[PDB]
From Swiss-Prot:
This is Eukaryotic translation initiation factor 1. It comes from the Eukaryota. Belongs to the SUI1 family. The gene is EIF1. Keywords: Acetylation, Cytoplasm, Initiation factor, Phosphoprotein, Protein biosynthesis. Component of the 43S pre-initiation complex (43S PIC), which is composed of the 40S ribosomal subunit, EIF1, eIF1A (EIF1AX), eIF3 complex, EIF5 and eIF2-GTP-initiator tRNA complex (eIF2 ternary complex). Interacts with EIF4G1; in specific 5'-UTR length and AUG context. Interacts with EIF5; which in a mutual exclusive interaction associates either with EIF1 or with EIF2S2 on a common binding site. Interacts with RENT2. The modification N-acetylserine is found at residue 15. The modification Phosphoserine is found at residues 15, 22. The keyword Cytoplasm applies. It is found in: Cytoplasm. Gene3D superfamilies: SUI1-like domain. The record marks 54, 78 as: Binds 40S ribosomal subunit.
């Protein structure tokens, strides 16, 4: 170890783990100005999840967390009057969860409010 030695009986280096140094083109990083990951244009993947024969939950993946979480979903319940929520899926990462098959309303919402982009319109009905 040879780390911190100023305690009576603890020593927990884990206490100093706040994700330090996580950005540096000249240190732990690599990006090609010409070589890009893939031509995806960062679309907005929808995807529906109908547990039963109606318990649908249209989700939205790709959207930026910077968006107005409130005006984002809250507005949904004001336009279509549907049940919308915000979930941070581990398989996708930060994805809204609408109630019922909104694959046609959400994409319409993303464009109606200006959330996603017509080019990002990635609707994938289960």
């Amino acid at each position: 170890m040879r780390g911190s030695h100023h305690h009576h009986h603890h020593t927990d280096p884990m206490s100093a783990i706040q994700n330090l140094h996580s950005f540096d083109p000249f240190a732990d990083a690599s990006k090609g100005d010409d070589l890009l990951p893939a031509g995806t244009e960062d679309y907005i993947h929808i995807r529906i999840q109908q547990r039963n024969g109606r318990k649908t939950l249209t989700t939205v993946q790709g959207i930026a967390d910077d968006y107005d979480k409130k005006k984002l979903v809250k507005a949904f319940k004001k336009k279509f009057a549907c049940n919308g929520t915000v979930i941070e899926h581990p398989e996708y990462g930060e994805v809204i969860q609408l109630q019922g098959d909104q694959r046609k309303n959400i994409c319409q919402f993303l464009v109606e409010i200006g959330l996603a982009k017509d080019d990002q319109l990635k609707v994938h009905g289960f």
